[PDB]
């Protein structure tokens, strides 16, 4: 099936003629994809020669544990990552239970890519774009059931005082349809962009069933386009949550917000505010702000906060089929479905 519960519709490498491969290291993933570009005669095929389902069984806990003990030594190191460039045959990278990576997955000008069950953390090279996951000019990408983490902290003297660590899931360019679901994102200062600049507007992205904990900002920092955020559990947000900018439209439904500062806002530009349609969240009126520890702050430039907790715009009819559970059920059940080792389980009303 190509159903992701969001805008992206892809089966990834799970199609007719898929070749299954086992990668035991980063370098293996690199060599495997490289071989997947060759035809029966050894000549390269544009977009790839055949579909792939790579099961990553490597484990880099040692690297992860060492970086966690000295987080400020990470930013200056060389970034580590596997690039999936111009591969359109369909590819799925799935981590085996127990696998871990201290390298990122960078998708560029590709399509039909699924990344599942990967535990990625404390990547080196924050000053050199060391993203855990990057989706650039790539439509139909599904980032599901991964655990993306680092430390929600900024060391002194880093370039732009913002490069201790890079992002969890940055999306830019023509990544027209993307679904980011069931991820356990924790300890990340900059979660993810949805547009790299004021000019990089557009895309239809869906963030669902994600569990965010101890994150500073960008859930996402949206620039234009559409964002459908449903059934996410947002806790301990130390900066701001969904920042809807450049006239972007957001549909925020059935999420659970708690201990969050500026959970829904439009700031930093001073103009062209985005809009949001709020519905079914645990917060229903300003009165709930104290109940769930929601705080608001101003910005030096003109801004708009959802402090009245009312819809400020409209949202087109959601194309795909999806069935959200109640915000309370996400608060109760989600932690057990989000992340790695959950066998890619999904939260249904039956389980509520
Ligand atoms: Ca980045």
Swiss-Prot record:
Gene3D superfamilies: Single-stranded right-handed beta-helix, Pectin lyase-like. Pathway: Glycan metabolism; pectin degradation; 2-dehydro-3-deoxy-D-gluconate from pectin: step 2/5. Pfam families: Pectate_lyase_4. It is found in: Secreted. Ca(2+) binds at residues 129, 131, 166, 170. GO terms for biological process: pectin catabolic process. Belongs to the polysaccharide lyase 1 family. PLADES subfamily. This is Pectate lyase C. It comes from Dickeya chrysanthemi. The lineage of its organism: Bacteria, Pseudomonadati, Pseudomonadota, Gammaproteobacteria, Enterobacterales. The gene is pelC.
